[PDB]
Every structure is written in C-alpha cells, then in structure tokens.
C-alpha cells in the first residue's frame, strides 16, 4: 500500500475527463476497493475532492453512486 | 389466581394434547392412504413388469 498512492494518481488523473457512465462507475468501484488500503491522508486530501466531483456529475446514477461511495469511504 | 393458574396449565395440557391427538390421527389416516395408493401402484407395476 506504500506504492498504491502512485497508482491512485493514475486513477484520479482520469476522473475529471471521463465520458461514459460505465467508466465513471468503474472509477467509483476502484476508489471504493482501494479506499480501505490507503491512509486517511490520501482519502481525505486526494480522493474526497474527486467524489465531490462525481456528485456534480451529469448522470444521476453517477451522482447517486458518488455519494454512496463517499459515505462508505468516509 | 394461583389456584386457577395450576388448573389452567392442565386445561392447556389437555387442549394441547387434543390438538396432537387430532393431528396424529389424520397423519395416520394420510399415512394409510399412501398405503393403498402405493401398494396398488406396486401391484399394477408388478403385473405390468
């Protein structure tokens, strides 16, 4: 999990430019699976900014899942 | 109530038994209908065989 923060910025660098609902949902699944394996510093400082982003997503399913993921991560 | 409670436990023990007597009776009645059905099925299947 020491190298995980290197993979996290691979994922989070995609999230502001995703187009399809499936890739925004898969992006959310990844965050949820990695969340227990990252430090609270990575969760709050790095991943929360990108869950509040999907909360403002155009797709209602994406917004709905962003909150559901955020709740489980926090 | 102490006197009625004792007698009322029995009144339930009796009534509860009655329900098991009824059920067990009809269970035999159903258990015996499968006798005539499956024994007759046994017969017909033995002549058929």
């Amino acid at each position: 999990e020491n190298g995980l923060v290197i993979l996290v910025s691979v994922i989070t660098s995609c999230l502001q430019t995703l187009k399809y609902c499936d890739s925004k949902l898969a992006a959310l699944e990844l965050i949820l699976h990695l969340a227990p394996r990252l430090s609270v510093e990575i969760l709050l400082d790095r991943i929360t900014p990108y869950l509040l982003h999907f909360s403002n997503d155009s797709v209602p399913r994406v917004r709905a899942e962003a909150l559901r993921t955020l709740t489980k991560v926090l | 109530m102490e006197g009625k409670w004792i007698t009322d436990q029995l009144r339930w023990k009796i009534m509860s038994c009655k329900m098991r007597i009824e059920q067990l009776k009809q269970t035999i009645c159903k258990g015996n209908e499968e006798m005539e059905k499956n024994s007759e099925g046994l017969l017909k299947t033995k002549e058929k065989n």
């Binding site: - | 004792i6 009796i14 035999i28």
Partner: protein
C-alpha cells in the same frame, strides 16, 4: 383520579368475588382427562411409527 382508583378497586373486588364464587376446578378431575389422553397419544405414536 380518585374515581379511577376507586373503580379499579371495585373491579378487583368483583373479580375476587368471581374467583371465590366459582368452585376451584378439581385438578384431579382434569388430570385424569389429561392422563387418558396421554395414553391415547402414546398408543397412537406407536401406530404412527409402525
């Protein structure tokens, strides 16, 4: 409140009257009725097992 409490006492007193006025059922008389049915149940369970 005094009326409610007095009514409660009247109720319990009446029920005490009913419980005392009725003859306490003979446990023996009901118990034989239970024992006769216990014999029937067991005699039957044997039949069911067969």
């Amino acid at each position: 409140q005094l009326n409610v409490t007095e009514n409660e006492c009247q109720n319990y007193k009446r029920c005490l009257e009913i419980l005392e006025q009725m003859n306490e059922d003979d446990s023996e008389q009901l118990q034989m009725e239970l024992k006769e049915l216990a014999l029937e149940e067991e005699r039957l369970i044997q039949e069911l097992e067969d």
